[PDB]
Amino acid sequence: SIGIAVILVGTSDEVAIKDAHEKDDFHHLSVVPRVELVAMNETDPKSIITRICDLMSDRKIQGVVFADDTDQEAIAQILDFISAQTLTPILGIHGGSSMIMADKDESSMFFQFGPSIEQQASVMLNIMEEYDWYIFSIVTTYFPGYQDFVNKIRSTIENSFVGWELEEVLLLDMSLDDGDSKIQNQLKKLQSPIILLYCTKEEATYIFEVANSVGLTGYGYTWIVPSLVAGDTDTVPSEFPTGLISVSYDEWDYGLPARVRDGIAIITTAASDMLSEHSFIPEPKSSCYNTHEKRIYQSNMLNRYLINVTFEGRDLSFSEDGYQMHPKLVIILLNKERKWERVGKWKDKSLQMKYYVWPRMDDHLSIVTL
Amino acid sequence: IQNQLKKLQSPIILLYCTKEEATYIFEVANSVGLTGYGYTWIVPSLVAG
Amino acid sequence: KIVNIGAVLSTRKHEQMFREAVNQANKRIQLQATSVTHKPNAIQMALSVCEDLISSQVYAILVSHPPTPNDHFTPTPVSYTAGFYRIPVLGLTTRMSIYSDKSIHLSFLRTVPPYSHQSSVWFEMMRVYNWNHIILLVSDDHEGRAAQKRLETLLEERESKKRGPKAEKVLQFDPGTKNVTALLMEARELEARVIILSASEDDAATVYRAAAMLDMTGSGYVWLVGEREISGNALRYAPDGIIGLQLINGKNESAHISDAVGVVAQAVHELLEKENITDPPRGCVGNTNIWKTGPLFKRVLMSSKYADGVTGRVEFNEDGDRKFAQYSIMNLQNRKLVQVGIYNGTHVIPNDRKIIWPGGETEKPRGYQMSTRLKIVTIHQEPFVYVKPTMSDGTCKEEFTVNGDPVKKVICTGPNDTSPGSPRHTVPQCCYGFCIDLLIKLARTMQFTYEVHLVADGKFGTQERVQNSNKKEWNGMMGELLSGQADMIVAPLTINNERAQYIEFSKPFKY
Numbered sequence A: 001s002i003g004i005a006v007i008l009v010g011t012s013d014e015v016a017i018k019d020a021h022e023k024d025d026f027h028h029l030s031v032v033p034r035v036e037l038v039a040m041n042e043t044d045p046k047s048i049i050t051r052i053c054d055l056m057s058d059r060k061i062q063g064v065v066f067a068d069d070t071d072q073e074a075i076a077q078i079l080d081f082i083s084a085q086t087l088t089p090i091l092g093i094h095g096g097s098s099m100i101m102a103d104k105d106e107s108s109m110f111f112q113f114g115p116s117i118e119q120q121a122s123v124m125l126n127i128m129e130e131y132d133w134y135i136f137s138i139v140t141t142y143f144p145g146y147q148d149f150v151n152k153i154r155s156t157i158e159n160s161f162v163g164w165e166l167e168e169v170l171l172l173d174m175s176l177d178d179g180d181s182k183i184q185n186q187l188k189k190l191q192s193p194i195i196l197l198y199c200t201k202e203e204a205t206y207i208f209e210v211a212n213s214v215g216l217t218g219y220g221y222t223w224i225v226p227s228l229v230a231g232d233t234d235t236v237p238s239e240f241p242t243g244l245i246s247v248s249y250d251e252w253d254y255g256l257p258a259r260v261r262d263g264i265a266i267i268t269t270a271a272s273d274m275l276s277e278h279s280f281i282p283e284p285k286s287s288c289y290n291t292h293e294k295r296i297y298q299s300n301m302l303n304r305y306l307i308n309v310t311f312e313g314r315d316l317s318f319s320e321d322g323y324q325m326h327p328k329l330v331i332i333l334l335n336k337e338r339k340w341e342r343v344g345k346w347k348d349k350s351l352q353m354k355y356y357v358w359p360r361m362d363d364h365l366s367i368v369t370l
Numbered sequence B: 001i002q003n004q005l006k007k008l009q010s011p012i013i014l015l016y017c018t019k020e021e022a023t024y025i026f027e028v029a030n031s032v033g034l035t036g037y038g039y040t041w042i043v044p045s046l047v048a049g
Numbered sequence C: 001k002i003v004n005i006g007a008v009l010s011t012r013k014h015e016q017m018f019r020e021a022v023n024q025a026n027k028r029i030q031l032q033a034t035s036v037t038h039k040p041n042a043i044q045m046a047l048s049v050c051e052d053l054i055s056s057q058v059y060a061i062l063v064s065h066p067p068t069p070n071d072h073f074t075p076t077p078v079s080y081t082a083g084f085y086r087i088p089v090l091g092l093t094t095r096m097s098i099y100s101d102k103s104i105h106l107s108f109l110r111t112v113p114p115y116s117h118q119s120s121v122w123f124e125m126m127r128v129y130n131w132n133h134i135i136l137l138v139s140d141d142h143e144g145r146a147a148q149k150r151l152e153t154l155l156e157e158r159e160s161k162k163r164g165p166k167a168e169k170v171l172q173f174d175p176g177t178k179n180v181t182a183l184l185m186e187a188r189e190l191e192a193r194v195i196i197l198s199a200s201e202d203d204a205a206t207v208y209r210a211a212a213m214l215d216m217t218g219s220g221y222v223w224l225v226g227e228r229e230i231s232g233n234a235l236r237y238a239p240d241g242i243i244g245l246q247l248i249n250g251k252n253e254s255a256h257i258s259d260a261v262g263v264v265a266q267a268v269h270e271l272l273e274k275e276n277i278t279d280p281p282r283g284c285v286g287n288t289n290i291w292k293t294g295p296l297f298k299r300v301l302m303s304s305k306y307a308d309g310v311t312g313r314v315e316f317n318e319d320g321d322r323k324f325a326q327y328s329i330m331n332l333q334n335r336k337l338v339q340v341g342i343y344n345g346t347h348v349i350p351n352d353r354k355i356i357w358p359g360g361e362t363e364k365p366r367g368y369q370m371s372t373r374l375k376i377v378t379i380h381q382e383p384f385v386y387v388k389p390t391m392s393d394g395t396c397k398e399e400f401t402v403n404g405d406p407v408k409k410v411i412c413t414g415p416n417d418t419s420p421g422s423p424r425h426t427v428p429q430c431c432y433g434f435c436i437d438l439l440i441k442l443a444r445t446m447q448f449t450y451e452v453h454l455v456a457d458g459k460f461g462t463q464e465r466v467q468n469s470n471k472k473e474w475n476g477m478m479g480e481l482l483s484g485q486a487d488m489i490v491a492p493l494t495i496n497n498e499r500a501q502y503i504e505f506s507k508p509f510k511y
Ligand SMILES: *[C@@H]1O[C@H](CO)[C@@H](O[C@@H]2O[C@H](CO)[C@@H](O)[C@H](O)[C@H]2NC(C)=O)[C@H](O)[C@H]1NC(C)=O
Pocket: C179, C180, C181, C213
């Protein structure tokens, strides 16, 4: 009986999740849907650690699905540390604690439902390519991840026959007015009607208000930015303009029951494949109080087949880092009503964005020809 | 003045006001980014005094 | 008000030393101390931290390393549990390879510097001996990637503003494999002779055995090694001349504890003059909130505060790392760890002692020795390069010109006797012509010796998208010149703009 512990904290989602076990699509007669919908309201380190250890010691748990309601990556850090300690595949999916983290340790390879910075850079370049905006710049800060961003941009900017015109790459520092003078002079020298940036929320607000003071309005400067400055929606400050284009995960038309059923289907299919191709399942040593039980790390890695799972006619492969190979991204844009609505969709390297010609930000004339 | 000086893009600028208004306009333009590299400001003797 | 400074140590002697140090620092509110021993399992240790170490939680916890060679799984859980509430962490002795990430670890302050500063010291040492060529090679995934990125951003930023060092070839291999003779021979086939390495202990022993098998010690191979490779497990099989580095006070836990309590007392005295103080709760269970004092306290600590202690001036860079450390330049003077000098800040200081180099040479070896056996590629073009089969004797039939002078044939070694249906390297086919005649005149004028082989694809070369991958690669002659398969192109090659980007075309031979 494969133990599946689905933990939901913060909010209350008592819903028909039992449809996962009621589907009866488990071909291999060994992945018993032992679901444990334990709920709680105190998202404390000791609390969750004692909870997962007691749940693993009472029953025979081999897979830990997870969900939450806060926006703290420390929960994901604790989850990955527990995964490193007990060497069990865990799943933090579309709860708001997915919050993709990079350069993970040599733990039991687990993936979380969140796109990588490289995929966001790729979808932003596809957006820029769709509307023939072959000129831009780069304005990053000293936040961990800017180097990977600029390296991906450079690797995708000189491996194609498209005339991309990289104006200048900025590396600002939040030290004194020297950075202010630098960004002012550079944005006065940019003169490119597309701008990209990568920083946190408060730094984004600071940079946007400084640029608006220098004169970065929404007429020509159409700022683009990944989901790092967006964060939790419905909390838009006044510094953001009405032309910002941001990308993010499928937070609107992706149901939490759908997410948890996809996760449990992934777990069951991977376990079925591994137990059918190996004919031996490792022992779930439920100590979590003594490193002596860690000697069971001698069989083949379950992750090697877990990262190669597909079900329901949809590709659900994963990389060694722990991110989706097909994140199913969606494009978002804020209007003059200070509201973020969906515009386009990106899935399987295909952009189905509607709103053909740029719900444009008195010289804009159409022309008929034949 | 910020939007216009961002839209000027001409390496010669003329103005006509008093001394304090000249200082105000110059500091505002320098905050917007009117440095001495390309923008070579010209002004009559009214702001010099 | 009282401030109970939490701590976690491995030995009771360190706990007594920390108690004495905080009692001394109390002379300058009040300060306290709490210490918990290390557990074999980090889960129960994390529970004890959440229950006992942060029972007051108003402090900056300090953590040490166990005698185990892990040094990562023991310091990571305290850092995670403290960064959950944005509580700063003090690090006495840790593997700072991964702990320099502000996204993984929110707040973390260390006492020992990472190997990035060791690569910086390597570069500073290189700036003295005028070594402008070096072939580095890393083994670990993250540590190696970090060291490579540090060396690359040091060498590239300095090159932008003589020729200036070029890292000729950056090699990488698995830290778990043992077959590296291929990479060793590939590095040997290059010009640089100043191999800088940054592997683990077992990897260092393996690469030392591989270099001893290939004999990379003939008084020309200069070695620059790190502190993680000068250990006994690798020193048992280490070659002479292996210049290494070692940090002072690497195992002195009491001095690190004293410095940490001093700097944290200075930080408390500096921050107590603030306006808002969000005291963390007396218990970690049920308190789901962010302490506003954490980030601001870390910012005002790392900004300018410093307390002189056992290591003198201690400045923190913008990563949570202590800068301006002490490095001892150690040389293997016949299995004797003699200190050639000391390092401090940015200046290197040699003790003017008997310093030698591997291979018994008492003089400073050169950076490299330029080869005189450069490969040359050539295409078959109608009146420039003739291609005729050779005779069965081994040479080919020699003829005379219209006047009676030799025709200056050269033994090409290109696959021109076969078709694309069955490509196979054939017997050398002697070649002659107008620009092979030009090639011999260039070789006598600058005294080099060359071989020649024709192209494999056949075309001159252009940019084309590959069939399967995404990156674009050159073709034929351009690809063989760029991808280290040819050092010159003696053939009719029209100078263009798409080719001058990566090639340095000389003045034109004929218009
Ligand atoms: C791994 O390393 C060994 C030792 O370096 C290699 O063995 C050598 O074998 C080749 C034959 O292909 C000889 O030309 C070399 O002279 C040998 N080296 C020594 C030091 O004797 C071996 O080829 C490498 N690869 C594998 C797969 O074992």
